[PDB]
């Protein structure tokens, strides 16, 4: 039995379920209340962050890595989504999980001119293990749409055209 603070998240998931088709058909709606683990990661300047620091906003939490081919390919879309919808009620939190060479993802984002995402990172890649433990990280990338209480609305095991019409419509619906 999940955290009852996450019941509104389930209702939200049920409300937007019809919108999960086309580009976002691989998004699986939450069917039970599920509080995500309070992921711990760093910002671009190495300051500690936690998922709960972002409570109060709807979020798309993404895990990506430079060694992940479909992840590199979807970073521009995530950046674009960030630019379209980031505001008082929504943010994309893309967390890099490279463990080998910390300068590599920074160079990747810079050469790709992706600056709206900042540079969240977990050089231990523990955040992947945390989501794997609740059955929400089956591969890479993994992205979870999270409500203002840190609860699961939906999870996708794979990449998506996140700046597409289908994706924006779904995210806006989840937010408001």
Quick one: CATH superfamily? Glutaredoxin
Helix content: 25-40%
Strand coverage percent: 15-25%
* Termini Cα gap: 27 Å
The coarse overall form would be globular
CATH architecture: 3-Layer(aba) Sandwich
Structural class: alpha/beta
Number of domains: 1
Named CATH topology: Glutaredoxin
Number of strands: 8
Radius of gyration: 15 Å
CATH class: Alpha Beta
Strand order of the largest sheet: 1-8-7-4-5-6
Reading the helices and strands in chain order gives: HEEEEHEHEHEEH
Biggest sheet overview: 6 strands, mixed
SS field, number of helical segments: 5
PDB class: membrane protein
Keywords: thioredoxin-like, double disulfide bridge, membrane protein
Assembly: monomeric
Entry title: crystal structure of the soluble domain of tlpa from bradyrhizobium japonicum
């Amino acid at each position: 039995t999940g955290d009852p603070a996450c019941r509104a998240a389930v209702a939200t998931a049920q409300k937007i379920a019809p919108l999960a088709h086309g580009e976002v058909a691989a998004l699986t709606m939450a069917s039970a209340p599920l509080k995500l683990p309070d992921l711990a990661f760093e910002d671009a300047d190495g300051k500690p962050k936690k998922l709960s620091d972002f409570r109060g906003k709807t979020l798309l939490v993404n895990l990506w890595a430079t060694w992940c081919v479909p992840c590199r390919k979807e970073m521009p879309a995530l950046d674009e989504l960030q630019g379209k919808l980031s505001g008082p009620n929504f943010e994309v939190v893309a967390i890099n999980i490279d463990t080998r060479d910390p300068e590599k993802p920074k160079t990747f984002l810079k050469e790709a001119n992706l600056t709206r995402l900042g540079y969240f990172n977990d050089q231990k890649a523990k955040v992947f293990q945390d989501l794997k433990a609740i059955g929400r990280a089956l591969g890479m990338p993994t992205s979870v749409l999270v409500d203002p209480q840190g609860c699961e609305i939906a999870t996708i095991a794979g990449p998506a055209e996140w700046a597409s019409e289908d994706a924006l419509k779904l995210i806006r619906a989840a937010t408001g």
